[PDB]
Design a protein around this ligand. Structure first.
Ligand code: HEM
Ligand code: K2B
Length: 395
């Protein structure tokens, strides 16, 4: 039995995690770590828990050692559903498709800033900035404010770990206080001068039949923000790395663009930026072999599910043509990712431009293994130095 702490961010930065997952799925599908924390590791157990929200609740909060906050992802139905339908319309496949030109322009702009150099950090220069700009435009973040909001967002999720230092914990709290002050100013201004963005939509929203409190407005806005700017970035970087480490996949996708939809799904399965989500049990229950107590939280291990040999043949092989590919990177059930269509378009347009404008893109050193972020919620590549043949900007 692996001696691991599933709340320790270092576990998810270690490249031993998938070996630990394999042991869980084979010996104790609903695993208990060294501290007794329960975690569903099989595709089956995760699905079954997602399908029983009355037993596996979100109302205790989605994080292990953290109370629930006034945001829809920390809510059960009917309260959660009333919130989601306040922002549902703008995230449909058809409404997301309308933003194609805008997102494409952002992609080309970000590649223009490095194309003359012949080298860059794919994470810092392309993967991270693109979704920041996209969700920022939806939330009302000004372009000159993007880097600041992303710095706050980084500080909010980078140090989530049972082994967080006192100093790092203070960085997280300071960033939330900073975000809190700025956004409360924005919330009031959107009440005096309503605009088109999402914050303005929530500010003027009503739930049977009262307006949302300022505490909720701040938290719902943060939910959308972090969902946008701390997730897709990791599928971009980690998925592009798989194309670069298996250039037969890069080549295959290069000569046939119609394979891009399937490639995006395999990137999502492989990277699984959200490593887990918590569920609180409303009653004692025997769940797929493991006794669970009322009031304790069980983790849904999305990456473990995404490599479950019971569902995916040769899951350690990256195959852009993988069909079926019913991965659980976006989860399942009533909390199924709101921005799943937005994220897929972000990944498709950026990858399409990387293949076209950086056609000979390579890792600086294919031998070295790239470091992962030691956090217990969302995690991905810290950096990704790349090289390519320079080209003139498009303007
Ligand atoms: C690769 C990119 C993304 C991944 C892997 C991802 C993953 C997830 C996961 C695992 C959940 C919880 C599902 C569950 O517990 O079953 C979720 C929910 C959510 N995500 Fe995403 N997400 C991504 C991108 C985005 C984007 C771009 C947005 C932009 C708004 C977003 C907004 C949300 C929201 C608001 C929820 C809460 C939905 C609810 O509780 O009803 N996410 N996401
Ligand atoms: C769609 C997913 C990415 C969900 C995103 C959830 C985000 C909004 C949640 C997850 C962890 C949360 C943080 C957990 C730690 C914390 C404790 C506090 O005392 C202040 C608020 C903060 C600083 C929380 C702010 C909101 C966060 C960052």
């Amino acid at each position: 039995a692996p001696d691991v702490d599933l709340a320790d961010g270092n576990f998810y930065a270690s490249r031993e995690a998938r070996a630990a997952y394999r042991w869980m799925r084979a010996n104790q599908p609903v695993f208990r770590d060294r501290n007794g924390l329960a975690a569903a590791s099989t595709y089956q157990a995760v699905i079954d828990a997602e399908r029983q929200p009355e037993l596996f609740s979100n109302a205790g909060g989605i994080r292990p050692d953290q109370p629930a906050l006034p945001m829809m992802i920390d809510m059960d139905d009917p309260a959660h559903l009333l919130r989601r339908k306040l922002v549902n319309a703008g995230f449909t496949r058809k409404r997301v498709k309308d933003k194609e030109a805008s997102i494409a322009a952002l992609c080309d702009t970000l590649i223009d800033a490095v194309c003359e150099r012949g080298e860059c950090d794919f994470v810092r220069d392309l993967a991270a900035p693109l979704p920041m700009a996209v969700i920022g435009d939806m939330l009302g973040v000004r372009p000159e404010q993007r880097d600041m909001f992303l710095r706050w967002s980084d500080d909010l999720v980078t140090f989530l770990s049972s082994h967080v230092s006192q100093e790092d914990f203070q960085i997280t709290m300071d960033a939330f206080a900073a975000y809190n002050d700025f956004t409360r100013a924005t919330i009031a201004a959107r009440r005096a001068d309503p605009t088109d963005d999402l914050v303005s939509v929530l500010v003027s929203s009503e739930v049977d039949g009262e307006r949302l409190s300022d505490d909720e407005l701040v938290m719902e806005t943060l939910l959308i923000l972090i969902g946008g700017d701390e997730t897709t970035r990791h599928t971009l970087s980690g998925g592009t790395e798989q194309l670069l480490r298996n250039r037969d996949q890069w080549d295959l996708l290069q000569r046939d663009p119609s394979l891009l939809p399937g490639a995006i799904e395999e990137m999502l399965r492989w990277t699984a930026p959200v490593k887990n989500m918590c569920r609180v049990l409303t009653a004692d229950t025997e769940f797929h072999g493991t006794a669970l107590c009322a009031g304790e939280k069980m983790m849904l291990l999305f990456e473990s599910a995404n490599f479950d040999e019971a569902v995916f043949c040769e899951p350690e092989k990256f195959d852009v043509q993988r069909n079926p590919n019913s991965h659980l990177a976006f989860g399942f059930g009533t909390h199924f990712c709101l921005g799943n269509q937005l994220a897929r378009l972000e990944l498709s347009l950026m990858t399409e431009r990387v293949l076209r404008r950086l056609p000979d893109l390579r890792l600086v050193a294919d031998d070295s293994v790239l470091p992962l972020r030691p956090a217990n919620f969302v995690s991905g590549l810290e950096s990704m130095p790349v090289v390519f043949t320079p080209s003139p900007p498009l303007g």
